[PDB]
Each structure stands twice: as C-alpha cells, then as structure tokens.
Design a protein around this ligand. Structure first.
Ligand code: MG
Lengths: 44, 207, 216, 221, 226, 255, 49, 293
RNA sequence: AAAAAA
C-alpha cells in the first residue's frame, strides 16, 4: 500500500532479486574486526 | 461442551461425460497434498488429501512403515463416523500393497483425507475411487515410494481397485446393486482405472 | 541406454540381468535396485518374471562404481544420520556425565546441508547424546560438561555409532567440531563468536563464556 | 475505586493472594520453581502453567481466552532465564463474577492479572518490573470514560476495555504497555483519551499495591 | 527501614565496585543492576531479603533431605516436595569405599550440605562438609520429627545466635537439633511428649512470627501436655 | 506375534499347490464350534459361540415399539469388544459392516417385523466379544444368526398397541451369514486361523442370504505386512467356493 | 503484537496490544491504526460483495 | 506428582497415635472447628476446617428434564480439583480415585437421601424445569475433602433462593430480584458427612486398632483405612461408604456412628444458626436503607 | 534391573 492507500501488486521478479540479494550477502559475511588494548606486550 | 462452542443444547438443527480436475502440492503444511474434483451427470465430488510423513517413531522396532488413513467431513455432515472408519480400513488395505513399506523402517505415514463438497442431484461408494486417486497422488507427490499406481472405478455400487495395469486387484468393495455383474463391473472399472491412471501420471509430470 | 529415461511409479525400466556383445566377448551387465526402484515379480506367458520397477516419479540414472546401479532421482527422506557424517545439533538438556541434544541438519558430501524438518515441541525430532569422553581428545577422563556446552547452543558434531533406535552418539573431538552459534546467558544476552578453541567471547557486551568452540 | 487485597492466605502453596474489586473477587495461587513435566520443559527459559476457573460451571473456551491473555502479561514480568528448565504453576480461581459473566469477561480479567502479580511477589519469583490492571468502560449515552466500573454500568455501556501497564522506578515511569484489550464500538479519539485517564489511574493502583506489599512482607522480615 | 520494589532504580552508585548476591539481577545485555524481588536491601555486600517458601539449590547451604530413590551411581534426594531431585554421591560420605556402599534406605533423613549447585544442572550434596571436622551433625538422622517452615524462619534460626528459639527451648527441655536452609527443622528428644511439645511451638511461632512471643508460647505448650 | 522363521514356514506351506494347513484342514473345512442359545430371560433372544482358538462372542436380541414411517432402520447392531474402545477403528468398522449385512433393504425382510400399518417391531442387536484371536466378523455373524433363529416377542392381539400377556411370537427369518476368506499365494482358504491370517497375502469378506451370495462383499487385509495384490481369478474362485460350501454350514447351524 | 478490527465507517471494534519484547510508542499505534484503516477499507470493497 | 513422606515422620505420627496424641493437638473423636462465611450474593458460602479451606457457589438455569423423569428436576455437582490446593492435584482430572469418591458420596447424600426436592424444581412436566448446579472450589488442601465439601454444599443450598417463576401458557417468564423476592429451595433434612481414618500399628500384636475423626493431610497419607458415614438430626443414616481398607467389626462401625451423631448434630445447629443470623442480617439492612428514603 | 565372601 502506497501513500494514497491504493493496493499495488508486488511483481514476481521483485521478490526474486530480493532472494538473490539475500543469498549473496548471507553467503559471504563481513569479518567483524575488534581490537583490544595490550599494555603487557612490547616491540622487538 | 467445555471443548468447543456447540451453542444452545435446547435447540434443533435444520429440518427440510466424465470430468476431472487434479492439483497437487498446494499445501506447505505437509509433505504431500492433492486436490481431486470430479463432475458427472448430476453428481460432483471435491475432496482434499494431505500426507504427513514419513516421520520417525521413537522406540519403534517395526521393520516396515505404518500407514494410517482418516476421512473427515469438511462441510456437509452426511456420512456416519462408523462408515468413515470402514472406508479408512478399506483404503489402508489397499495402499499397504501399493506403498513400498520396506523403505521406511521404524517410521509412520499419516494420511488425512478431507471430504469437502459432495453434491448429489450405495452412497459413499461413488466417492471411493476418488479417494484412492487423491491418496495415490498425494503419496507420489510427497515422495513416498509406490510399487504401482493405485486407481479404481465405481459400477452399480461395485468398487474395485486395480494396479499393474488392471492385471491384478488391490481392493474390492461391493454394496447393494445386483448380482451377476461380476464380469461387467470388472471391465467397466478397469476402463475407469486406466482413465484415472493416465490423468494421474500426467498430473505429476506437468506441474 | 535403450531404457526409458523418464519413469513414473509402476513403470518398467529394465529386466533382472542384461548382456551385450563387444570386442568379441560377452559383457554382463548386472542390474541392481536402488533408491526409487523396487525389484518385483510380474507374470506373462504363464511364466514368472523379475524386473526393476521405479517407485518414485523422476529421471532414471545408471551409474557404476569401482555392475549397473539403477536409481530414480526425484525433482530429505533418503538423508539419514550414518556413522561418519557431520551433523548440526542443538542442546536440549545438560547432565553431569553426558549431554543430550537433537538433530537438526546433516552435512552433505562434496558447504551444503540437509535440513530435517520436524516439530520441536513434540519430540518427533531425532535425539542424540554426546558423551563426556567424546567432548575433546585433550584429557578424555576429566571433562567439565558445564564449561563445554550450554542449553540452546548450536553444536557441530560427527556421529560415531547409531547405537539403539533412540539416541545417536556424537563427538566433538576434532578441531572443526564444537559450539558454533551461541548467545550470552543461555540466549538472554547478545550474540557470541568463537575465538579460542576453549573460549567464546562476545564483541558487543564484552561478555566471555567458556565453551567448546570449533575452527573457523 | 476502593479495593482490598491480602497476601499469603494459602498454606501448602509457595505463594498466594486474594484480590477484591467491587463485587468480583479472584483468589490466586503460585507454586514454583518446581519440577516440570516432560512436555513443559524449556531448556533455557522458565515454563508457565496458567489455569483460570470461573465462579460457576466448568472452565470453557471463555476461560481459555482468559488464560491466554493472562499469559501475555505475566510472561515479560518474570525473568525466565533465572530458572532454566523449571515450572511455575499459576492458578486463578474466580469466587464471584462481579458482573455479567456471559456478556463481559474483562472485569474478571483485570482481577486475574492483579491477583496473579501479587502471588508472584509472595512466592518470591524474579520479576523484571511491576504491573497493574484496571477495567475501563464507555457508556453509549454519556460518552464518558469510567475507570473501574460496576455491573450495572457495563450493561448500558457501548464499549468495554482492559488496560495493564508495566511500571519501573518507584512505580512512576512506565516501561511498556503489557496488555491492552478493547471490545465494542469506539473511535481513535476515545482511545488516546482512555490511556490519558488510564495511566493516571493505573499509577494510583500501583502506589496502592506497593503499600499493600510493605504491610505484609515487612513483618515477616 | 528501606523497602525495595522490582524495577525501581538502584540507590547504590555504579561508580564504586559492589559484589552481587541473591535478590539482585545483572542484565546480560543492558548490563544494569535491578531488583527482582520485594523486601529490605541489606548493604554492608549487596543482597535482598524476600519472603519465599520455596528453596533453591545454592553453594555452601545446609539442607535436610529425604532419600526418594537409590541408584547405582548416586542417591536421589528430595530437599522439598515437587522440587527437582538432588544428586548425593556414594563418595560423599565420611570413610568412603569403592565396592562397599553406605547404608541408606528410601525415606532416610540425611543432613548434608550443597557442594555444587548450577542453575542449568542437577544439584549435588555431600554428607561431609568441606570442611568442619567432618561432623557438624552430618549424616543419617535417626527417628525424631521434622517440621516445614518458611525460608525466613529457617535461616535466621541457623545463622543468627540472637534468635530466642534454641535459647528458650533449651530451658524447657534437653535435646539435639538440626536445621536446614530449605525450611526443614529436625528435632529429637528422649520422651515423645517433649518432641511433640517442640513441634507445636515452632508451628505456632512460624505462624505468628514474633520475637518476644517465643517464651509465652513455649510456656503454655509444655504445660498443655501435662 | 510370530517370528519370521514361523511366517516363512507357514507361507511356503500354504502357498504350495497341495496347500498344507497348520491344523490339517482342507481349504473348505471349518473349525469345530459350540453354540448356546436362549440363556437370557431378560432378553428376547440370546446366543453364545465358542471357537477353537478360544474366541467367544455373546449376542443379545431385544426389541421395542416405534413408528416405521419415522424410522427407516428397524435393525440396530451394536458391537462391544472386550478390552476395546467404543470409538476404536476395528470396532466401528465391524459395527458399520454388520449394519450393512443386516439391513431392512439388504439381507433382511422388512415385512417380517411388520405388525400393523402404523407400528412395527424394532430389533436391537447387541454384541459382546469376550475373546478375539482373529477377525470376529465371521464369528459374530454365526452368533447373530443363531440368535435370530431363537427369538420370542410379545404376541399381538389386534390387527390393521396391545400385546399378549403370556403367549409369545417366535420370529422366523433367514439371517445373513458372513464368511471370511484368506488369500495366500494362489490358493483360497475358508475360516482362516489366527496364525494363517498373519501370513496371508490378502483376504475376502463375503456375505450370504437365501441360498445366494449377496452384499456386502469386501476385500480386507488380514495383516499389514505380507499384503499383496491378487489376480481376478481368485475372486471368482473364492466366491464360487463360498457358494458351494454354504449349504453345508447353514445346514449344520440349523440343527 | 497488535490486533485491529477496523470498519469502513472509521470506527473500531477489537483492539489487542501486547508488548513483550519492546516498548510500544504511541506513534506506532497511530501508524498501526492508519494501516489497519486502509487494510479494512480495501477488504470492504474488493469483490463487490 | 506425589507427596514425599520421610520414614521418621511415619514412625513419629504412628507412635503418637498409640499415645493418644496428634500433631494438631486434637482428640480421636473430636472434629475440627468449622467456620462458615457467606458472601454478598445468595448461595455463596466459604467453609474452613483448621487449615482446610473450601468454597461453594450455587447456581441455577432454565432447562429441560430427562425423558425418564419428566416429573422431576435436575441436580449436578462439580468437585473438580485445581492445583491451587496443591501441586499434588493435576489439572483437569475427573478420573481421580479419591476425587470421584468425594463427588459420589455427597451426591448420594443429596439426591438419593431425598434431601433436596427435585419435584418442586419442576416448572412444566416434561417440558421445562430448574437445573440446580453446585460447584465446589477446593482452595487449600489440609485434608477432610469429603467433610468440608459436605457442609459447603448443604449450607449453600439452604442459603440459596431461586427467582420466582410464573407460568403463562407455554411461555416461561422470569421475575427480577428487585420486583419479587426469590423463593428458597426446599430441604427436608440436612445430611453431614464424617470421615474416619484407621491405623494398625506394630508392637504394643493380637488386638490393636486406632480410629480418628477428620484427619489432617499428614494423617491422611498414613491411614490404613477410610470410612465415611453421613448422618442427620433425624436419627437416621443417610449413607455410609467403606471400601476395603482395614477390616473392621460391625460393632466398631456403629461405634463410629455414635461418635459421628454427636458431631453432625452440633454443626447442623451451627448451620441453622448462621443461616438465622445471616437472614436477619439482610433484614435489618433492608429496613435501614428504606428509612433513609 | 547394582548385589555376597576374601
Ligand atoms: Mg469396549
């Protein structure tokens, strides 16, 4: 339903690319990188 | 009744060319489903069959599968519950020969057949070949291994189910009618079987 | 293959035995039933006959392994936990000497998985038990089960023996096996990720709980 | 809206309470944490067994709705992750209808909520916050909003309502609405006017409830 | 007194480190400290005292349990009705043995302490403290009589030595007593009339709940049997 | 509950061309039974049948008065099997089957129960199965048959309600019989034993009225395992088998 | 969850709101009642019944 | 779920009964003091015996009588036990041994004893009549289910008053409570049940039996025999139910009837008194409200 | 569905 309140049939292709976008994004997850302070370690 | 809403108990109820339509796999609640609609003369029948399984039974030591069939009244309350159990027992005597039970050890297959709409312008004898058609479709759609396609026909109240291309019989239902119709009913139902068989096979391939 | 490609349930595919003539010698093709097929008996000309008959609607596949295997592939059921397979499970309850779970999905072979659909509020789902000795190869004798698994945590394991017809026996001894997905405080907190093999941390609330983690 | 309540009227139960509002009187009881049945076991959270019986006859589908609505309120209240794989039996028995039980069940619902929460307190269960429920109705003619009406006021009422809010910080700040039931003909303007008077009266019973606990719990300690 | 309600703001500042305890809950996500019960907040240590008739397994707690089952691995002991069972190992007894097992039938009263108690795991008790001379009254309780009371009356009786119960009962009669933190009190005397006199007192004292009414009840109870 | 070693033995024995039964019976032989009748004074008719395996069925016949214009079914058969529910699958199946066997427009004359043009006798048939080691459909059938042969009702006085205070009417009718058959291999069998049905490939339920085969006729699965399809010639053979050996059993149960 | 029974006339019948996982802001009620009005007005006249 | 009882308790209570002592400090022939409180509405009644707390509510509706008895009325009792009385009782269990027993005992005390007139509950013969229902709510379980439910039902029926009905042709009309006063149900006699508990201790072995009246929850689990006798002020036995248990002489049976008659007579005069005090309580309140008009 | 002697 749009702003006017009129029913709009969602295309059968619309949901297809939604699955293509989801399956592609879920297959390769971005590696979560977080750093922790280590005052006990020293360089060479 | 504390289970459902039956309303006032002091009240009383109201007092007053073969064509087929096959559809399968329209229910996502189960493993296999089927819709069968037949219209002939002044009598049409629409029923739905759902198949849930095969699902594992805990502690079961059965080396083969276990089939359970139950018929239900969807809308019109006509057939007696006692008679529904009888047909169910007849139907299970059929598919226990049809279904390859050796494939599902320690498992069980539940079959629900909903009798939705039946117009009539014995009695339940005519619906039997449609119940067999529905179940055989729902089982084949579900993935259950069937040794052969089960089908039947109704001739003068005499129902007989065939497999292996009508060469053998997996079920026989004779009620009322008359005598000496043995050879005739076997030939008339065999034509209905072959007709129902090809439409069933075509139904599974097309969709 | 001189045999029908498409097969509905009840359709004749090929007889019991077969043979052909090549290189001046008779080659014997041995037809054996498979998933989707069933060897049954037919009668014709007053004489018995045995032939491979498909029981499921689909395409016929004739393959050979180092004999001709005849099977029918549909357009789940065949997939069942067998010794050596990898299975994703969920912890249902924790005891002191063991840890019982329930089987959700099973890893396929060359990742892809086979999800077993069942009702978790009934008990129809396959149940499995992970022994305390099968937790890790390191120190098999003394293992604290509380510091390894947790109710609700997802555990990737491998089935050793089926045992009886009730519970499956799994193990998380190797590196690629252990708790995969888990949350803080039995699922009340935020998501946690696997860092060390024996330590699971959460890069959100800074919470750290002791689990048995697998290798990324 | 003068009410009355008691705490710990039952012996063999872990916690109990007796709520009184107008004519509707609903006594509640709570046992837990105890050993759960195999079918009720929840590996992480805490299981809730809720039972609501009427004043006359046997529990029907009507009471099944009362149990379902009561469950929605007590669920977020109790910290389920404190008692993994355990059981809590909550039974609410209605002693008197206090209304027309055939046409209206929203008066008894609020009382079942109030009595249950008090029993949860007495039984010593982990609660995230506090709660209070009041029955509301709107007369067709006067078109006024009445908080905690009577039996005769419901018969001529156009629409009936039920409000249950969650309270934090000394029973002042409202975290979230737990339950909001409404039945009958009403518009949107009457709805926001219902919460305006409801939230005020709810907090009035919250602070009223709080002092009831103090008078009963403190002498035990 | 300072009365506390669930969901209310916590008076104690989050700046200074404060050790947790029973009565308060640490939110696994928002990391805020909130009260979950109703009672009086005691700050020395932070915990909340609330009225409860149901006991929960906790480390270092003295409990009186009843053997409801005998297995090969351990004992099944119920510290309270309808509650989950507790695991009492065979090695949890003084002078333990391998092949030889301690003699305990179904229904025998045992006075033990809870060693390991996890929320998501079956609790465990041991019939020998860890440790206080191995004899704090631990072991089988022969004969006598037990009484069910609330948890508030049980803990104050065992811990607080200013509680005028063991003080007032010792003057009326000479007896040995064992008190569990699960609301169970086991008292054994010589004559049965004395045990009955002790049962009726605690039954009335727990009901009325008055510190200065102990001597009054005990006087009229012991003179009633005669 | 037989072992596979027993089932494989009994099958190879029954499926053989000179079919050997475990008890030596020929394919048309019936096991010796025992029928007691008229042992219930409170009921209009009664019967009791003991079988070889220890199966037992008690059938009671009672009646009342009602308008036959408002009641289409003047014959109600109720089946109660010991240790079984009233809504059980097998119970309600037999309950529905026997009602088709004994019906006003099937195998029972409706004019026999006709007293006047307004009122008629409605017969209530009750069935109590004490012990059942097999399908009692044939056992119950022989019990209801002997129960209707020996029946006594209040004798009418007027014509076309009042009854005779002493003298009584003896209902003389031809009650239907139900013979269960077993299909093992290519051979047909009459009166299947307990252990025979567990290995039988299929089965037949055939009725009988007035020296002729009649409805209902069903094809029941005696088990759930070795159930297989059968050739049409077996149905023609089975029906003919019942046809020729029925005057023998009827003649026996007549005495 | 939020359950609404809206009528084409503009009024309402059944209103069920239960928050168990998050706070329920009044702006979401107005958003729910707005979406329920159009949903009910669409189902009122669709198949011309 | 089952109640776990220690071996020490079982030995203590049994030995105490041999010394004529019990936990609640009572006698063997003594019955627990019963207090009866009526609610606002008529028919609502609360009965309490020591720690045992029950509740009863009498209702009524217009229904049709059975075809077997068209000249009679309808009566039914609900004794369903909720877990409120304890976790020992399951939810929705009518197949309970002691539960169906309590239901039948109080049913035989009301119906088959001719206590309540079902013929006077018949509006139209073979058409419509009154249907009196009594729902027993078991609040707290300290024992004495049969006894407490027996008083609650009886006291409720005598305190209950059905709306006056006038027959107009085939139409049945109902008069409001403000226009006309409700007519009380007719009770010929008041039956009251007394529950006995038998014990057979060891040691001090030829002849030894212990019988107490109205046992508590702890005493009810240790008893070897159960006996329930129902008596009234009319010097007659309403009903008596002894199923198995410890075998007893016929003399000891009538010995328990004599001890019970002194108990039922005392509380029946208490019920009639509390009915009298409550009847005049509503009378003085009705006159005060009118005087301020 | 552990148990007894040494
Ligand atoms: Mg039966």
């Amino acid at each position: 339903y749009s702003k006017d309140g009129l029913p709009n049939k969602v295309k059968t292709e619309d949901i297809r690319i939604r699955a293509q976008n989801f399956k592609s994004a879920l297959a390769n997850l971005e590696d979560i990188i977080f750093e922790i302070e280590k005052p006990l370690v020293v360089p060479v | 009744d504390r289970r459902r809403l039956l309303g006032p108990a002091a009240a009383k109820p109201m007092a007053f060319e073969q064509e087929l339509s096959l559809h399968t796999g329209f229910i996502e609640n189960c493993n296999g489903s089927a819709l069968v609609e037949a219209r002939s003369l002044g009598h049409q029948t629409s029923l739905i069959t759902a198949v849930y399984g095969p699902r594992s039974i805990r502690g079961s030591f059965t080396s083969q599968g276990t089939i359970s069939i139950q018929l239900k009244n969807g809308l019109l309350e006509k057939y007696n519950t006692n008679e529904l159990k009888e047909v169910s027992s007849f139907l299970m005597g059929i598919f226990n020969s049809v279904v390859n039970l050796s494939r599902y050890p320690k498992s069980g297959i539940d079959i629900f057949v909903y009798l939705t709409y039946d117009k009539d312008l014995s009695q339940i004898s005519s619906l039997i070949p449609h119940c067999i058609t529905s179940i055989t479709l729902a089982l084949a759609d579900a993935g259950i291994e069937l040794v052969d396609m089960a089908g039947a026909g109704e001739a003068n109240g005499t129902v007989v189910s065939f497999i292996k291309n009508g060469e053998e019989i997996v079920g026989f239902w004779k009620d009322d009618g008359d005598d000496e119709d043995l050879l005739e009913c076997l030939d008339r139902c065999k034509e209905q079987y072959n007709r129902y068989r090809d439409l069933m096979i075509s139904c599974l391939m097309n969709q | 293959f001189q045999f029908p490609e498409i097969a509905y349930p009840g359709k004749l595919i090929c007889p019991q035995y077969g043979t052909e003539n090549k290189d001046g010698e008779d080659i014997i093709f041995n037809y054996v039933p498979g998933p989707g097929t069933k060897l049954i008996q037919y009668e014709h000309n007053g004489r018995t006959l045995e032939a491979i008959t498909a029981t499921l609607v689909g395409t016929v596949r004739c393959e050979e392994e180092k004999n001709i295997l005849v099977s029918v592939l549909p357009g789940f059921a065949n997939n069942l936990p067998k010794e050596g397979d990898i299975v994703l499970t969920r912890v249902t309850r924790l005891s002191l000497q063991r840890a019982n779970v329930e089987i959700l999905a099973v890893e396929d072979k060359p990742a892809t998985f086979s999800v077993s659909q069942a009702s978790s509020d009934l008990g129809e789902t396959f149940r499995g038990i992970i022994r305390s000795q099968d937790v890790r190869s390191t120190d098999r004798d003394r293992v604290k089960v509380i510091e390894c698994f947790k109710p609700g945590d997802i555990v990737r394991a491998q089935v050793l023996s089926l045992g009886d017809g009730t519970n499956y026996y799994l193990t998380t001894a190797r590196n690629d096996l252990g708790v995969v997905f888990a949350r803080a405080a039995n699922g009340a907190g935020g998501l946690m990720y696997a860092t060390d093999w024996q330590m699971m941390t959460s890069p959100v609330t800074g919470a750290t709980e002791k689990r048995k983690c697998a290798k990324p | 809206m003068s009410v009355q309540a008691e705490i710990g009227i039952l012996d063999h139960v872990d916690g109990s309470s007796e709520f009184v509002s107008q004519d509707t009187k609903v006594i509640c009881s709570v046992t837990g944490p105890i050993e759960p049945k195999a079918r009720q076991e929840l590996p992480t959270q805490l299981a809730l067994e809720i039972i609501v019986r009427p004043a006359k006859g046997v529990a029907t589908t009507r009471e099944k709705v009362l149990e379902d609505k009561l469950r929605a309120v007590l669920t977020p209240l109790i910290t389920r992750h404190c008692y993994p794989r355990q059981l809590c039996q909550i039974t609410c028995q209605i002693l008197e209808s206090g209304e027309d039980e055939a046409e209206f069940s929203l008066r008894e619902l609020s009382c079942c909520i109030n009595a249950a929460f008090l029993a949860l307190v007495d039984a010593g269960i982990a609660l995230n916050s506090m709660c209070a429920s009041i029955p509301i109705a709107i007369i067709k003619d006067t078109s006024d909003i009445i908080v905690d009406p009577t039996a005769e006021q419901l018969k001529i009422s156009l629409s009936v309502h039920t409000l249950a809010l969650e309270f934090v910080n000394g029973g002042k700040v409202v975290k979230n609405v737990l339950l909001l039931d409404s039945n009958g003909d009403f518009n949107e303007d009457q709805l926001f006017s219902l919460l305006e008077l409801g939230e005020q009266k709810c907090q009035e019973l919250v602070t009223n409830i709080r002092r009831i606990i103090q008078d009963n719990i403190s002498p035990r300690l | 007194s300072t009365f506390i309600f669930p969901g209310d703001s916590f008076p104690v500042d989050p700046t200074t480190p404060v050790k947790l305890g029973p009565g308060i809950y640490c939110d696994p996500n928002t990391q805020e400290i909130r009260p979950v019960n109703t009672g009086v907040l005691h700050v020395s240590t932070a915990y909340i005292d609330y009225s409860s008739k149901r006991y929960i397994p906790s480390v270092n707690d003295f409990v009186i349990g009843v053997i409801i089952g005998t297995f090969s691995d351990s004992y099944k002991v119920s510290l309270q009705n309808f509650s989950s069972s507790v695991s009492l190992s065979y090695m949890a007894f003084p002078n333990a043995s391998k092949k030889n097992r301690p003699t305990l039938q179904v229904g025998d009263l045992v006075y033990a302490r809870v060693c390991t108690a996890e929320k998501e795991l079956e609790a465990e008790i041991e019939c020998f403290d860890s440790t206080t001379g191995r004899d704090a009254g631990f072991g089988i309780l022969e004969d006598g009589m037990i009484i069910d009371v609330n948890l508030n009356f049980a803990r104050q009786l065992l811990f607080n030595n200013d509680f005028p119960l063991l003080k007032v009962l010792a003057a009326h009669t000479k007896f040995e007593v064992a008190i569990g933190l699960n609301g169970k009190i086991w008292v054994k005397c010589e004559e049965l009339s004395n045990t009955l006199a002790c049962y009726r007192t605690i039954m009335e004292c727990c009901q009325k709940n008055d510190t200065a009414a102990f001597k009054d009840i005990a006087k009229r109870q012991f003179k009633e049997i005669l | 509950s037989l072992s596979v070693a027993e089932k494989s033995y009994l099958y190879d024995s029954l499926a053989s061309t000179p079919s050997i039964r475990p008890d030596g019976r020929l394919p048309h032989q019936f096991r010796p039974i025992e029928i007691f009748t008229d042992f219930l004074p409170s009921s209009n008719g009664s019967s009791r049948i003991i079988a070889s395996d220890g199966s037992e069925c008690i059938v009671s016949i009672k009646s009342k008065v009602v308008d036959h214009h408002v009641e289409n079914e003047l014959l109600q058969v109720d089946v109660d099997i010991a240790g079984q529910r009233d809504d059980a699958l097998v119970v309600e199946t037999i309950t529905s089957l026997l009602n088709k066997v004994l019906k006003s427009g099937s195998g029972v004359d409706s004019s026999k129960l006709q007293l006047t043009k307004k009122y008629s006798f409605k017969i209530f048939v009750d069935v109590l199965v004490i012990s059942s080691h097999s399908h009692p459909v044939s056992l119950i059938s022989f019990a209801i048959y002997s129960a209707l042969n020996s029946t006594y009702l209040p004798k009418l006085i007027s014509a076309f309600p009042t009854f005779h205070d002493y003298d009584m009417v003896k209902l003389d009718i031809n009650p239907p019989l139900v013979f269960i058959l077993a299909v093992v291999g290519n051979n047909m069998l009459l009166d299947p034993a307990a252990n025979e049905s567990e290995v039988a490939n299929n089965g037949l339920i055939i009725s009988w009225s007035n020296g002729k085969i009649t409805s209902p006729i069903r094809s029941v699965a005696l088990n759930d395992s070795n159930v297989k399809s059968f050739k049409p010639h077996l149905l023609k053979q089975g029906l003919a088998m019942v046809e020729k050996y029925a005057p023998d059993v009827v003649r026996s149960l007549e005495n | 969850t939020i359950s609404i029974l809206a009528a084409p006339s503009g009024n309402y019948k059944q209103l069920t709101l239960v928050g168990g996982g998050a706070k329920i802001t009044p702006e979401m009620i107005k958003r729910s009642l707005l979406l329920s009005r159009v949903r009910a007005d669409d189902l009122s006249t669709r198949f011309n019944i | 779920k089952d109640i776990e009882i220690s071996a020490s308790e079982s030995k203590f209570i049994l030995e105490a009964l041999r010394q004529n002592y019990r936990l609640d400090g009572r006698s063997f022939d003594q019955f627990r003091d019963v207090e009866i409180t009526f609610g606002k509405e008529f028919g609502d009644v609360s009965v309490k015996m020591g720690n045992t707390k029950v509740h009863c509510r009498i209702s009524c509706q217009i229904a049709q009588p059975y075809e077997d008895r068209p000249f009679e009325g309808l009566f039914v009792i609900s004794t369903e036990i909720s877990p409120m009385a304890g976790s020992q009782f399951e939810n929705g269990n009518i197949t309970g041994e002691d539960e169906v027993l309590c239901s039948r005992i109080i049913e035989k005390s009301v119906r088959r004893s001719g206590a309540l007139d079902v013929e006077g509950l018949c509006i139209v013969a073979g058409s419509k009549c009154w249907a009196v229902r009594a729902d027993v709510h078991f609040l707290d379980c300290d024992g004495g289910f049969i006894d407490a439910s027996c008083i609650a039902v009886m006291a409720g029926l005598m305190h209950f008053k059905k709306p006056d009905i006038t027959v107009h042709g085939e139409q049945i009309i109902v008069h409001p409570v403000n226009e006309r006063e409700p007519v009380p149900l007719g009770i010929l006699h008041i039956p009251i049940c007394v529950t006995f508990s038998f014990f057979n201790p060891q040691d001090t072995e030829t002849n030894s039996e212990i019988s107490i009246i109205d046992a508590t929850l702890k005493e009810e689990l240790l008893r070897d025999g159960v006996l329930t006798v129902t008596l009234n002020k009319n010097r007659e036995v309403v009903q008596v139910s002894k199923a198995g248990g410890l075998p007893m002489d016929a003399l000891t049976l009538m010995k328990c009837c004599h001890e019970a008659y002194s108990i039922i007579e005392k509380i029946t005069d208490q019920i009639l008194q509390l009915l009298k005090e409550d009847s005049e309580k509503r009378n003085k309140y009705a006159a005060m409200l009118t005087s301020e008009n």
